[PDB]
Amino acid sequence: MAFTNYSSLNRAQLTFEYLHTNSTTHEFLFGALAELVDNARDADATRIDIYAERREDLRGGFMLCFLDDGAGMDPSDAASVIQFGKLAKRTPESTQIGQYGNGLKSGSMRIGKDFILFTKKEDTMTCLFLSRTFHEEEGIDEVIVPLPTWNARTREPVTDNVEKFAIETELIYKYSPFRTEEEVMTQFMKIPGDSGTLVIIFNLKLMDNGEPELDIISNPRDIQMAETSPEGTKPERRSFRAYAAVLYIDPRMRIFIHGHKVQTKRLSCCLYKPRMYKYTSSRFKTRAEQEVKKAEHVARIAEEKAREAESKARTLEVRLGLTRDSRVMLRQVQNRAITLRREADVKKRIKEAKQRALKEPKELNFVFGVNIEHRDLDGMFIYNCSRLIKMYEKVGPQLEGGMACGGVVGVVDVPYLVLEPTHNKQDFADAKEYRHLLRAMGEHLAQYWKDIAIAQRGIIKFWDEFGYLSANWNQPPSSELRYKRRRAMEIPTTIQCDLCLKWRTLPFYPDTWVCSMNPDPEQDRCEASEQKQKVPLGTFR
Amino acid sequence: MAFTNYSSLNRAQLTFEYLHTNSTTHEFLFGALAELVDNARDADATRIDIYAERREDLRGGFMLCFLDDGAGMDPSDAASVIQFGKLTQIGQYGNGLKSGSMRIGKDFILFTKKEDTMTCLFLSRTFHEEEGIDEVIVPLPTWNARTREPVTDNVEKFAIETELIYKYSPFRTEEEVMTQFMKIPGDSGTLVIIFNLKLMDNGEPELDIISNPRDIQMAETSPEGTKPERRSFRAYAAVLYIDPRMRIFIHGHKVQTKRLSCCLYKPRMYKYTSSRFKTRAEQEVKKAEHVARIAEEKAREAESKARTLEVRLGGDLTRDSRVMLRQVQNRAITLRREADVKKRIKEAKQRALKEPKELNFVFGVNIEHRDLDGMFIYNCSRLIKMYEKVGPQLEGGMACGGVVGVVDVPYLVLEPTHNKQDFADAKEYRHLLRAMGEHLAQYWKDIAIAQRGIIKFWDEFGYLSANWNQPPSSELRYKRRRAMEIPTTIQCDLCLKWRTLPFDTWVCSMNPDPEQDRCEASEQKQKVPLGTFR
Ligand SMILES: Nc1ncnc2c1ncn2[C@@H]1O[C@H](COP(=O)(O)OP(=O)(O)OP(=O)(O)O)[C@@H](O)[C@H]1O
Ligand SMILES: Nc1ncnc2c1ncn2[C@@H]1O[C@H](COP(=O)(O)OP(=O)(O)OP(=O)(O)O)[C@@H](O)[C@H]1O
Ligand SMILES: [Mg+2]
Ligand SMILES: [Mg+2]
Ligand SMILES: [Mg+2]
Ligand SMILES: [Zn+2]
Ligand SMILES: [Zn+2]
């Protein structure tokens, strides 16, 4: 639906140095790794393994590997990986984390110089190779990407251009970690199901002392930041095991680091006296109303177009009363009426669906609870379409010098209609609306504090009871048995089944666990339905 | 240096939606505007005008215009604007104009002039949306600056480009477009016009140009720890560069740009030896010396082959022998001049290595506005972080309250994030903040505000109120007590030099100091006294 032909006009293009520019969005390095985790989750993976493969010959001494059992990609899906940005016409997927068409490129190029991706779907498997080493060595200022595909059952090349295929694979054997077709096939065989994806980042960034930024040696079950950790340093900012555990508000996909299961968690299940407050969001309501007004305008224009075409069809029949050209013209009008009518009806259905959703409550659910195990790890955790964006954000009374609201963790999941993330997915694009949300969360936090009445009974004695002997607000509570049990009694023990993925409670560095290991006879089989945490409801003004 | 032919291989491409993705880097809206100001400064502009043009037919009701008298762009410079990624300039990422403009508005049109050309670059998301275009297609017509004839190798392309501009831009005819080019009055300069500005949910633009007609303010209520630089573009623009030269005007009214170190009580400078600075300079040298080493071995082999072939050919001198001898001899000549040029770069890096590898921390007391304190961190002169609390300021206390710190960090030590509002290397940035905090404690000991002591210090400058946030008294005796402590620095509107006065538009000849009394008098540098750490 364009006016002329634009084939001679200038196109904006990506140059090699833009790969670096894009990567500078990630000052928080774990946020780069999170992009690749998000992609596995969006592909409906039930499991992602993040692990190191030692390679003394590559910068940093290892390759960082992300292996998922998700849906994988066919060859055209794989070619769209290097499209920066997505397609505006794409069918809307409101619940996918991926919307910007950029995360894998920004994140991978923060972490290392090069990456190679292997993916399989149905009867194809495709390699995508992004080698900044190649571009530097050969003076390439474009961004050129080998993208060979093989048949997954026979291993024959699938290519319309055998010369292109030869050049692509030769680049891979020259510059990648894998020097032969056999070595490449070995990587494809690490995806053991019918589908999945393996992303390998290599030639990792080094600090000035020549050591990698990512330390996989100090704790061989973890990926840690290679930096000293001061007094108020949050575990999620130094330990990827800790960060990955809270990356999603509703974890289902299982996460393993170096082969060792991460205990993912629902933050609201780890806190003392969790309570939920429903916040009526005027922004949520106004934006839903605008999305409706737009759908109803789009259905309105399509209906007038269908109504005119049907009217013309009828009138043209009367006017024609019946020659050979006239016949053709009559069915071109009659069918055009038919197709506009079905177009108008489909847009009317979308309008109606948005109208139905408009009547649903336009609320954000703020959940608060007291972090009795780690009183200094407090503040708000703000998720956006289930993905963690801000952590440990102080609001309300926590912004004062005081013990008021000290220890309180808040959690909220914000839909895209209310806020969208910044380019690095570590902040919100609409700062004005985000600051509004934080003030609203602060007012509800104050109410939560009144509601649990810690101060009625008295705030210092509350903390004494859980074993905070020390006068320094940041030391952990006592580890002696009486205080451990006092704290543990308040926090249910939850665990995820490795087979069916349901979340279970037990009645008083995890290994394999399945439902039939539970001594509770009501949850002791994978077929037993999942029980929901019933977080009690509080009320505010 | 390409091995085989790569023309059939896939290229990464930019799609229309990427323009939006890229723009989401700017959560701080003024940091999007700063990208365009940075581009004028880098183009050696002596002036930028940022102003609104009312247009009730366009979204937000006005267009935001950036007009500079810098070096402008020839047609190939203009075309490289849409080559994403690029290259003591601020500009290094090849992105800022695109990320910033697309944060502010849906569309932009840029007009630029250099020598005998003038070029229009039109980025219309309206066009792409209306016509379902998923690539990023950019009209780029050029005219001759003197005759106004099109300069184009393809008149059909030129007709389509201009028709797009007349259809989708604010300017519907060639005459209207020429009127914009005529707003660039010198031989060179650039006019960037952002339009169809983003709206808030209430239908109003994010940028408020009404409340103060001499400013561009954020259209949001300001709580009262809210820093002026985060709601007033006039405030932000004044401190955007550590060494302002370019004059900045908003809606025709001059911004009083300033050097923060000149606005503070008892400024002192501490030299901080940076091991990061030294290690990175040493690595940049090791690299240059490897590059010159390889080139020299290549030149030495080629020269040796040239000499040996001369003695081997001896007296022969057939035509065939002569020509092939010169081929070898000239090849030696070229490699030798290549090797010599790399040896010169190596030497230059070696010389720079011996310069001190220091960051200069400057601290002073903000006696006019005690609550506007903390560190201002500049990166190659460009403000990155403001009001960052360090050292004793991170406690509850009056210790180091009111102290502003300033440091300019070279690219070798830190580079900025994608939005130029943070530092890409968080580990080294945190290290820098700790170092600044330690020096801040020393500065506090050094000015000995406890010899006075601290409450009596503040009450002498008129902080009568008990609340730390309220301004000091406005009564005349306290105004003069504060002003007496801050020397007066002022920029000449004609020659752009910075002057100190011994005491709107101002010029050098208005200075009563006989040594700085003429635009031709040499510029005097800040003499900040030096303190020492431990
Ligand atoms: N592990 C994976 N499994 C399946 N598909 C993947 C995987 N990783 C990437 N992709 C595909 O590659 C595309 C590009 O990924 P990328 O992260 O760059 O952008 P995105 O996920 O669409 O958006 P965002 O920028 O918001 O992350 C995805 O849209 C998806 O189609
Ligand atoms: N006002 C201007 N005057 C002259 N040249 C300009 C102007 N604005 C932009 N340019 C040119 O357009 C190019 C692209 O600008 P852009 O801001 O996108 O990237 P950059 O300044 O190279 O790097 P950065 O992304 O760090 O800002 C610049 O390199 C410069 O050559
Ligand atoms: Mg993604
Ligand atoms: Mg699968
Ligand atoms: Mg720029
Ligand atoms: Zn189960
Ligand atoms: Zn002068």
Coordinates of N, CA, C and O in Angstrom, one line a residue, chain A residues 70-169:
Chain A
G70 N 13.6 -25.4 24.0 CA 12.5 -24.6 23.5 C 12.1 -25.1 22.0 O 12.7 -26.0 21.5
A71 N 11.3 -24.3 21.4 CA 10.7 -24.6 20.1 C 11.8 -24.5 19.0 O 11.5 -25.0 17.9
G72 N 12.9 -24.0 19.2 CA 13.9 -23.9 18.1 C 13.4 -23.0 17.0 O 12.4 -22.3 17.2
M73 N 14.2 -23.0 15.9 CA 13.9 -22.1 14.8 C 14.1 -22.8 13.5 O 15.1 -23.5 13.3
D74 N 13.2 -22.6 12.5 CA 13.4 -23.0 11.2 C 14.3 -22.0 10.5 O 14.7 -20.9 11.1
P75 N 14.7 -22.3 9.3 CA 15.7 -21.4 8.6 C 15.2 -20.0 8.4 O 16.1 -19.0 8.6
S76 N 14.0 -19.8 8.2 CA 13.6 -18.4 8.0 C 13.5 -17.6 9.4 O 13.8 -16.4 9.5
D77 N 13.1 -18.3 10.4 CA 13.1 -17.8 11.8 C 14.6 -17.4 12.1 O 14.9 -16.4 12.6
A78 N 15.5 -18.3 11.8 CA 16.9 -18.1 12.1 C 17.5 -16.8 11.4 O 18.2 -16.0 11.9
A79 N 17.0 -16.6 10.1 CA 17.5 -15.5 9.3 C 17.0 -14.2 10.0 O 17.6 -13.1 10.0
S80 N 15.8 -14.2 10.6 CA 15.3 -13.0 11.3 C 16.0 -12.7 12.6 O 15.8 -11.6 13.2
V81 N 16.8 -13.6 13.1 CA 17.6 -13.2 14.3 C 18.5 -12.0 14.1 O 18.6 -11.2 15.0
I82 N 19.0 -11.8 12.9 CA 19.9 -10.6 12.6 C 19.1 -9.5 12.0 O 19.8 -8.6 11.5
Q83 N 17.8 -9.5 12.1 CA 17.1 -8.4 11.7 C 17.1 -7.6 13.1 O 16.7 -8.1 14.2
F84 N 17.7 -6.4 13.1 CA 17.5 -5.5 14.2 C 16.1 -4.9 14.2 O 15.8 -4.1 13.3
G85 N 15.4 -5.2 15.2 CA 14.0 -4.8 15.3 C 13.0 -5.8 14.8 O 13.3 -6.7 14.0
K86 N 11.8 -5.8 15.3 CA 10.9 -6.8 14.7 C 10.0 -6.1 13.6 O 10.2 -4.9 13.3
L87 N 9.1 -6.8 13.1 CA 8.1 -6.4 12.0 C 6.8 -5.9 12.6 O 6.1 -6.5 13.4
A88 N 6.4 -4.6 12.2 CA 5.3 -3.9 12.8 C 4.0 -4.6 12.6 O 3.1 -4.6 13.4
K89 N 3.9 -5.3 11.4 CA 2.8 -6.1 11.1 C 2.7 -7.4 11.8 O 1.6 -8.1 11.7
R90 N 3.7 -7.8 12.6 CA 3.7 -9.1 13.2 C 2.4 -9.2 14.1 O 2.0 -8.3 14.7
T91 N 1.9 -10.4 14.1 CA 0.8 -10.8 15.0 C 1.1 -10.5 16.5 O 2.1 -11.1 17.0
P92 N 0.3 -9.6 17.2 CA 0.7 -9.1 18.5 C 0.8 -10.3 19.5 O -0.1 -11.1 19.7
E93 N 2.0 -10.4 20.2 CA 2.2 -11.4 21.3 C 2.4 -10.5 22.5 O 3.5 -10.3 23.0
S94 N 1.3 -10.0 23.0 CA 1.3 -9.4 24.3 C 2.1 -10.1 25.4 O 2.4 -9.4 26.3
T95 N 2.2 -11.4 25.5 CA 2.9 -12.0 26.7 C 4.3 -12.4 26.5 O 5.0 -13.0 27.4
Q96 N 4.9 -12.2 25.3 CA 6.3 -12.5 25.1 C 7.1 -11.4 25.7 O 6.7 -10.2 25.6
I97 N 8.2 -11.8 26.3 CA 9.2 -10.7 26.8 C 9.8 -10.0 25.6 O 9.9 -8.8 25.7
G98 N 10.2 -10.8 24.6 CA 10.8 -10.2 23.4 C 9.9 -9.3 22.6 O 8.8 -9.8 22.1
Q99 N 10.2 -8.0 22.5 CA 9.5 -7.1 21.6 C 10.3 -6.2 20.8 O 9.9 -5.7 19.8
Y100 N 11.6 -6.0 21.2 CA 12.5 -5.0 20.6 C 13.4 -5.5 19.5 O 13.9 -4.6 18.7
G101 N 13.4 -6.7 19.3 CA 14.2 -7.3 18.3 C 15.7 -7.1 18.3 O 16.4 -6.9 17.3
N102 N 16.2 -7.1 19.6 CA 17.6 -6.6 19.8 C 18.4 -7.4 20.9 O 19.6 -7.4 20.8
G103 N 17.7 -8.0 21.8 CA 18.3 -8.5 23.1 C 19.5 -9.4 22.9 O 20.5 -9.3 23.5
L104 N 19.3 -10.4 22.0 CA 20.4 -11.3 21.8 C 21.7 -10.6 21.2 O 22.8 -10.9 21.6
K105 N 21.5 -9.6 20.4 CA 22.6 -8.9 19.8 C 23.2 -7.9 20.9 O 24.4 -7.9 21.0
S106 N 22.4 -7.2 21.6 CA 23.0 -6.3 22.6 C 23.7 -7.1 23.7 O 24.8 -6.8 24.2
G107 N 23.0 -8.2 24.2 CA 23.6 -9.0 25.3 C 24.8 -9.8 24.9 O 25.8 -9.7 25.6
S108 N 24.8 -10.5 23.8 CA 25.9 -11.3 23.4 C 27.2 -10.4 23.1 O 28.3 -10.8 23.6
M109 N 27.0 -9.3 22.5 CA 28.2 -8.5 22.2 C 28.7 -7.6 23.4 O 29.8 -7.1 23.4
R110 N 27.9 -7.6 24.5 CA 28.4 -7.1 25.8 C 29.4 -8.2 26.4 O 30.3 -7.8 27.0
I111 N 29.0 -9.4 26.3 CA 29.6 -10.5 27.0 C 30.9 -10.9 26.3 O 31.9 -11.2 27.0
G112 N 30.9 -11.1 25.0 CA 32.1 -11.6 24.3 C 32.2 -10.9 22.9 O 31.3 -10.1 22.5
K113 N 33.3 -11.2 22.3 CA 33.5 -10.7 20.9 C 32.7 -11.4 19.8 O 32.2 -10.7 18.9
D114 N 32.5 -12.6 20.0 CA 31.9 -13.5 18.9 C 30.8 -14.4 19.5 O 30.8 -14.7 20.7
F115 N 29.8 -14.8 18.7 CA 28.9 -15.9 19.1 C 28.5 -16.7 17.9 O 28.6 -16.3 16.8
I116 N 28.2 -18.0 18.2 CA 27.7 -19.0 17.3 C 26.5 -19.6 17.9 O 26.5 -19.9 19.1
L117 N 25.4 -19.7 17.1 CA 24.2 -20.2 17.6 C 23.8 -21.5 16.7 O 24.0 -21.5 15.5
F118 N 23.3 -22.5 17.4 CA 22.9 -23.7 16.7 C 21.4 -23.9 17.1 O 21.1 -23.9 18.3
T119 N 20.5 -24.2 16.1 CA 19.1 -24.3 16.4 C 18.6 -25.4 15.5 O 19.1 -25.7 14.5
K120 N 17.6 -26.1 16.0 CA 16.9 -27.2 15.3 C 15.4 -27.1 15.5 O 15.0 -26.8 16.6
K121 N 14.7 -27.5 14.5 CA 13.3 -27.5 14.4 C 12.8 -28.5 13.3 O 13.2 -28.3 12.1
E122 N 12.0 -29.4 13.7 CA 11.5 -30.4 12.7 C 12.6 -31.1 12.0 O 13.4 -31.7 12.6
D123 N 12.7 -30.9 10.7 CA 13.8 -31.6 9.9 C 14.9 -30.7 9.5 O 15.7 -31.1 8.6
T124 N 15.1 -29.5 10.1 CA 16.2 -28.7 9.8 C 17.0 -28.3 11.0 O 16.5 -28.2 12.1
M125 N 18.2 -28.0 10.7 CA 19.0 -27.3 11.8 C 20.0 -26.3 11.1 O 20.5 -26.6 10.1
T126 N 20.1 -25.2 11.8 CA 20.7 -24.0 11.2 C 21.7 -23.5 12.2 O 21.6 -23.6 13.4
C127 N 22.8 -23.0 11.6 CA 23.9 -22.3 12.4 C 23.9 -20.9 12.0 O 23.8 -20.5 10.8
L128 N 24.0 -20.0 13.0 CA 24.1 -18.6 12.8 C 25.4 -18.1 13.4 O 25.5 -18.4 14.6
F129 N 26.3 -17.5 12.7 CA 27.6 -17.2 13.2 C 27.9 -15.7 13.1 O 27.9 -15.1 12.0
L130 N 28.0 -15.0 14.2 CA 28.4 -13.6 14.3 C 29.8 -13.5 14.8 O 30.0 -13.5 16.0
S131 N 30.7 -13.2 13.9 CA 32.1 -13.2 14.2 C 32.7 -11.8 14.0 O 33.0 -11.3 12.9
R132 N 32.8 -11.0 15.1 CA 33.5 -9.8 15.0 C 35.0 -10.0 14.7 O 35.6 -9.1 14.2
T133 N 35.6 -11.1 15.1 CA 36.9 -11.5 14.8 C 37.1 -11.4 13.3 O 38.0 -10.8 12.7
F134 N 36.3 -12.1 12.5 CA 36.2 -12.1 11.1 C 36.2 -10.7 10.5 O 36.9 -10.4 9.6
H135 N 35.2 -9.9 11.0 CA 35.1 -8.6 10.5 C 36.3 -7.7 10.7 O 36.7 -7.0 9.8
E136 N 37.0 -7.8 11.8 CA 38.2 -7.1 12.1 C 39.4 -7.6 11.3 O 40.1 -6.8 10.6
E137 N 39.5 -8.9 11.2 CA 40.7 -9.5 10.4 C 40.6 -9.1 8.9 O 41.6 -9.0 8.3
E138 N 39.4 -9.1 8.4 CA 39.2 -8.9 7.0 C 38.7 -7.5 6.6 O 38.3 -7.3 5.4
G139 N 38.6 -6.6 7.5 CA 38.2 -5.2 7.2 C 36.8 -5.0 6.7 O 36.6 -4.3 5.8
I140 N 35.9 -5.7 7.3 CA 34.5 -5.7 6.8 C 33.7 -4.7 7.7 O 33.7 -4.8 8.9
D141 N 33.2 -3.7 7.0 CA 32.4 -2.7 7.7 C 30.9 -2.9 7.7 O 30.2 -2.3 8.5
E142 N 30.4 -3.8 6.9 CA 29.0 -4.3 7.0 C 29.0 -5.3 8.2 O 30.0 -5.6 8.8
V143 N 27.8 -5.8 8.4 CA 27.7 -7.0 9.3 C 27.2 -8.2 8.5 O 26.0 -8.3 8.2
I144 N 28.1 -9.1 8.2 CA 27.9 -10.3 7.3 C 27.8 -11.5 8.2 O 28.6 -11.7 9.1
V145 N 26.8 -12.3 8.0 CA 26.5 -13.4 8.9 C 26.3 -14.7 8.1 O 25.2 -14.9 7.5
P146 N 27.2 -15.7 8.2 CA 26.9 -17.0 7.8 C 25.7 -17.7 8.4 O 25.5 -17.6 9.7
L147 N 24.9 -18.3 7.6 CA 23.6 -18.9 8.1 C 23.3 -20.2 7.4 O 22.3 -20.3 6.8
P148 N 24.2 -21.2 7.5 CA 24.0 -22.5 6.8 C 23.0 -23.4 7.5 O 22.8 -23.3 8.7
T149 N 22.2 -24.2 6.7 CA 21.2 -25.1 7.2 C 21.5 -26.5 6.7 O 21.9 -26.7 5.5
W150 N 21.3 -27.5 7.6 CA 21.4 -28.9 7.2 C 20.1 -29.6 7.5 O 19.3 -29.1 8.3
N151 N 19.9 -30.7 6.8 CA 18.8 -31.6 7.1 C 19.1 -32.3 8.4 O 20.1 -32.9 8.6
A152 N 18.1 -32.3 9.3 CA 18.4 -32.8 10.7 C 18.5 -34.3 10.7 O 19.1 -34.8 11.6
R153 N 17.9 -35.0 9.8 CA 17.9 -36.5 9.7 C 19.1 -37.0 8.9 O 19.8 -38.0 9.3
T154 N 19.3 -36.5 7.7 CA 20.4 -36.9 6.8 C 21.7 -36.2 6.9 O 22.7 -36.6 6.4
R155 N 21.7 -35.0 7.5 CA 22.9 -34.1 7.5 C 23.3 -33.6 6.2 O 24.4 -33.1 6.1
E156 N 22.5 -33.6 5.2 CA 22.9 -33.0 3.9 C 22.6 -31.5 4.0 O 21.6 -31.1 4.6
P157 N 23.4 -30.7 3.3 CA 23.1 -29.3 3.2 C 21.8 -29.0 2.7 O 21.3 -29.7 1.8
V158 N 21.1 -28.0 3.2 CA 19.9 -27.5 2.6 C 20.2 -26.1 2.2 O 20.3 -25.2 3.0
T159 N 20.4 -25.9 0.9 CA 20.8 -24.7 0.3 C 20.4 -24.5 -1.1 O 20.5 -25.5 -1.9
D160 N 19.9 -23.4 -1.5 CA 19.7 -23.0 -2.9 C 21.0 -22.5 -3.6 O 20.9 -22.2 -4.8
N161 N 22.1 -22.4 -2.9 CA 23.3 -21.8 -3.5 C 24.5 -22.4 -2.9 O 24.9 -22.0 -1.8
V162 N 25.0 -23.4 -3.6 CA 26.1 -24.2 -3.0 C 27.4 -23.4 -2.9 O 28.2 -23.7 -2.0
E163 N 27.6 -22.4 -3.8 CA 28.7 -21.6 -3.6 C 28.6 -20.7 -2.3 O 29.5 -20.7 -1.5
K164 N 27.5 -20.2 -2.0 CA 27.2 -19.4 -0.8 C 27.4 -20.3 0.4 O 28.0 -20.0 1.4
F165 N 26.9 -21.6 0.4 CA 27.0 -22.5 1.5 C 28.5 -22.9 1.8 O 28.9 -22.9 2.9
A166 N 29.3 -23.0 0.7 CA 30.7 -23.3 0.9 C 31.4 -22.1 1.6 O 32.3 -22.4 2.4
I167 N 31.1 -20.9 1.2 CA 31.8 -19.8 1.8 C 31.3 -19.6 3.3 O 32.2 -19.3 4.1
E168 N 30.0 -19.8 3.5 CA 29.5 -19.7 4.9 C 30.2 -20.7 5.8 O 30.6 -20.3 6.9
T169 N 30.3 -22.0 5.4 CA 30.8 -23.0 6.3 C 32.3 -22.8 6.4 O 32.8 -23.1 7.5

